Amino acid sequence: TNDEEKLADIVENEIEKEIRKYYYILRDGKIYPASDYDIEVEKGKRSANDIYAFVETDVTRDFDEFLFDIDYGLPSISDILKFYLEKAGFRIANEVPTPNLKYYIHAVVEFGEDRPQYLAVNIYDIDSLARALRIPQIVEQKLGNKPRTITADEFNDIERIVAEEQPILAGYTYDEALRIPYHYYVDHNNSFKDDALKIAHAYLQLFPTPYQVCYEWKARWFNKIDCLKLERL
């Protein structure tokens, strides 16, 4: 929890810095835009082994979408699978592995006009997330326990099972589980209530609850705020 609080302030300080004018957080706490860092790795300047946390920032202007991204803003299946496989020792084709990645961070910023209103930082433990998605079992069944370089075809075959085949939430495949609550919460379509609540109930029980830190934009800076106060708005 102390590491997670430190990580949320690192993200908040960076979003704030970016406002007034994708990321990796290294094991030393330094934050860099991921695109640039990937080029520095490709040059041999920086090491992919130093990446501790991956940050995905989403920006919104609709409050319902903001709350929905906070509550359902899980990392991409491709990302969790890639992060799991690499953390387990497997290598995906010619791609540079990130074996020491512990956290996936989803930061959501809500805007007023051209100026911001809120920031919500969600910190997920990658291992916990991979387990809830049944990724270890599926990888073991398909590839075995001994790590090696896998083909893009093998990665895709695993990805398909995890996201589009297995009923993971209230009998729905993962992709269906993403769509239905969007239709209810963001599209404000009431006929989707029953199914969204069923998915919500399963998701809140089965999926790991993230370390959540919230902030309000007040006079050119972010100020800490209670997340439970936020959900009421």
Numbering used by the authors: 25 to 45, 58 to 269
Provide the authors' original text about this structure.
Acidianus two-tailed virus (ATV) infects crenarchaea of the genus Acidianus living in terrestrial thermal springs at extremely high temperatures and low pH. ATV is a member of the Bicaudaviridae virus family and undergoes extra-cellular development of two tails, a process that is unique in the viral world.
Two crystal forms of recombinant ATV were obtained belonging to the tetragonal space group but with different cell parameters. Crystals of the first form diffracted to 3.85 Å resolution and included one monomer in the asymmetric unit. Refinement against these data produced a new model, at 3.85 Å, with R and R factors of 27.1% and 29.5%, respectively. Remarkably, these interfaces are not conserved in the first crystal form, which actually displays less extensive contact surfaces, the largest masking 608 Å2 per monomer, none of them considered as significant by the PISA algorithm.
